[PDB]
Symmetry: C2
Subunit: 216 residues, 2 copies
């Protein structure tokens, strides 16, 4: 691996759906860049960049920090999912208070990593009963079986609406939007391969995922 | 007037690849049995047969049909466990991988104990081979790590098949005799009369045999 390395730090589960084929396209284009995944810490991946433990990080915030540079990837809606005969299917928009009684199905990661609890529930002092799964396919089947509700990107939810497993609803009057960024060290802003990996993620996402919007 | 047949189908499963065929099997069963409450009982990282005895689950997906009292086994299907490496990797030169070929290499597996893994349990552990390990909850991440020469892995042939087409990995035979996984659906012996439990197993079989290549009938 003459060129060097691209150690990707990612703690976001849905990210893998577009990140894994992005790596698959990058690899033949840059065969001398050693690829790696630095995952499973359940903490902010920006720290790993500062610690030289990772070369690029997939992040939900472009929180200004010294020594690190942010590159916008894309934004998307976080939709609420319930079974078609669940009482919440009657509401077009789900308020924070609509989550009170319901079991929430999420990835086994802390609330700080989850957009819905962090941006909507925690500030409103709402902590609903939780159910966890490492797999999206298991989350959908649990939701469909009325074993709880979940918040997932619209693009992820899409194939399952067609199969009639779940219905999707707007989370909050303002909606719930996730913003995705690629973080690198400021000293690495000139590496073509790092910049080209981000353009691969963007071209692939915008062509494969519905409901994506440009990030300023 | 009746509404249909009521009941509970709490599925106990600790196997990761299983979810690929088990989740759409639930999706087909659901409209057929809308009165049967479905659930997934997982995470424990232990034998799901215990949960049946404890009335904590109604059906368990298992890799062995260990004759146990108060429990009945139903064969689902068998398949080959193939070794995967990057096309560049030195191991691509060998058609068959012996237990000794794993000695130096980093092994990429699901984050679970060796008891739940067919390759370590049936091949490595008995030969006293414990290679360096790398873990991932996701198959898609295992394949990308293997393709980037971060290690090697053992996965069902049916799971590996879409990735061979994309050129990410190459597949090789594990051992001269090969490595076969055997899948069973375990239920309580009292519940052998419940139609939906039996029908869920026939759904898993019809779906698997029509969607997964390289499956073989299991007996008895």
């Amino acid at each position: 691996g003459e060129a060097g390395e691209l150690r990707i730090a990612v703690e976001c589960h849905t990210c893998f759906d577009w990140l894994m084929p992005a790596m698959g396209e990058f690899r033949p284009m840059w065969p001398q860049v050693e690829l790696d995944i630095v995952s499973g810490f359940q903490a902010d991946p920006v720290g790993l960049l500062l610690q030289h433990r990772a070369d690029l990080a997939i992040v939900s915030e472009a929180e200004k920090q010294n020594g690190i540079s942010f590159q916008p990837l894309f934004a998307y809606e976080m939709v609420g999912i319930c079974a078609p005969d669940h009482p919440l299917a009657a509401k077009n928009v789900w308020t924070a208070e609509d989550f009170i009684g319901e079991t929430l199905i999420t990835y086994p990661v802390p609330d700080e990593m989850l957009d819905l609890p962090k941006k909507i529930l925690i500030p409103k002092n709402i902590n609903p009963p939780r159910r966890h799964s490492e797999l999206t396919i298991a989350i959908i089947q649990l939701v469909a079986s009325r074993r709880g509700i979940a918040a997932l990107p619209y693009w992820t939810v899409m194939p399952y609406l067609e199969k009639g497993y779940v219905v999707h609803r707007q989370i909050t009057a303002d909606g719930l939007q996730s913003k995705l960024y690629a973080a690198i060290r400021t000293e690495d802003t000139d590496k073509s391969y790092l910049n080209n990996f981000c353009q691969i993620i963007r071209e692939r996402g915008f062509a494969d995922l519905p409901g994506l919007s440009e990030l300023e």
